[PDB]
């Protein structure tokens, strides 16, 4: 993880929907998990972690319980997936997310939610 | 590729005060948190504080109303301004990338000395 | 309020061996697992060795090994290399944000 990107800097999703942003690392050969972290947060709320090929939730924080996981079929093919479902308006604003596989990166991310109608 | 620089360091009398400069190059800012870390003569590393990717700001007890991080990001640069300075601030001051137990706290600064004496 | 205490303060070593430092933390650190392990050259700024707690940062030999969780951490350095001989500081990441330094290990060339 030399260099972590993501597709959009920006996403714009609907309330209650279920919302998918990733964080793409380089891949070469094939993934050991072994040396994988992956780190979710917002707003200095712990959302997931990835540690040890498992999730890590000893700090994570009390909103995204039950609500976000690490799509982890996506891990092979670098990508590091946070599912968060049932979107509500507290869901909106900056996330980030921290990549280590042999190198390290960090990657901002906006969130913005639409009114439910 | 990736360099961080500090500056702005010198003598200042006690009681002075003194605003050091982390010029980064390849760093996002609004991606990354930037850690100020000293080293009076003769002694070990001490945190000092360190400013968030989104501009939050956390302190050490023992520069707790003396010292004030800042970000300036259309300037590339990291600000640490240093109030009421005794003779004990004297060390070399480090700006480092990402927090002290960041997985990307690999680069750090040459440092910068800074000098406090009458 | 927070300290974090390493041992020992001085360790003595030949080229080959294998030496152990040791880093004790009043509290957990954040999520059991945020400790980090720094080499320091005189005259030079720090250089980061392993990160949360056993992960080598990028070029950092295999040699290098860190272990522990919660309260207790150990770096163990097998097989020992000329360029090992340093100053070691433990750091630790806490809730609310909150960091510290161990007081440094320093790692001379036994004769």
């Known amino acids: 993880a030399f260099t972590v990107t993501v597709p959009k800097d920006l996403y714009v999703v609907e309330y209650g929907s279920q919302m998918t942003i990733e964080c793409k690392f380089p891949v070469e050969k094939q993934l050991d998990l072994a040396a994988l972290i992956v780190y979710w947060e917002m707003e200095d709320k712990n959302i997931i972690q990835f540690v040890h090929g498992e999730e890590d939730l000893k700090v994570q924080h009390s909103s995204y319980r039950q609500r976000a996981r690490l799509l982890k079929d996506q891990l092979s093919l670098g990508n590091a997936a946070l599912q968060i479902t049932d979107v509500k308006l507290q869901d909106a604003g900056v996330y980030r997310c921290m990549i280590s596989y042999g190198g390290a990166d960090y990657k901002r991310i906006t969130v913005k939610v639409n009114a439910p109608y | 590729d990736v360099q961080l620089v500090e500056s702005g360091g010198g003598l200042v009398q006690p009681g002075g005060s003194l605003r050091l400069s982390c010029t980064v190059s390849g760093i996002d800012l609004s991606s990354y948190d930037m850690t100020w870390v000293r080293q009076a003569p003769g002694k070990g590393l001490e945190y000092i504080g360190y400013?968030?990717?989104?501009?939050?700001?956390y302190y050490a007890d023992s520069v707790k109303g003396r010292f004030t991080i800042s970000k300036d990001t259309s300037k590339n640069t990291v600000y640490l301004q240093m109030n009421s300075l005794r003779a004990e601030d004297t060390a070399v001051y480090y700006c480092?990338?990402?927090?002290?137990?960041?997985?990307?706290?690999?680069?750090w600064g040459q440092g910068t000395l800074v000098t406090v004496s009458s | 309020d927070i300290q974090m205490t390493q041992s020992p303060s001085t360790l003595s070593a030949s080229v080959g061996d294998r030496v152990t430092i040791t880093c004790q933390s009043s509290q957990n650190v954040y999520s059991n697992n945020r400790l980090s392990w720094y080499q320091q050259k005189p005259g030079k700024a720090p250089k980061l060795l392993i990160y949360?707690?056993?992960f080598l940062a990028s070029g950092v030999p295999s040699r290098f090994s860190g272990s522990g969780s919660g309260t207790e951490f150990t770096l163990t350095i097998s097989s020992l290399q000329p360029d090992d001989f340093a100053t070691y500081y433990c750091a630790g990441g806490y809730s609310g944000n909150l960091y510290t330094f161990g007081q440094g290990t320093k790692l001379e060339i036994k004769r």
């Open positions: 480092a990338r990402d927090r002290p137990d960041g997985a990307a706290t690999n680069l």
């Open positions: 400013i968030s990717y989104v501009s939050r700001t």
């Open positions: 949360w707690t056993s």
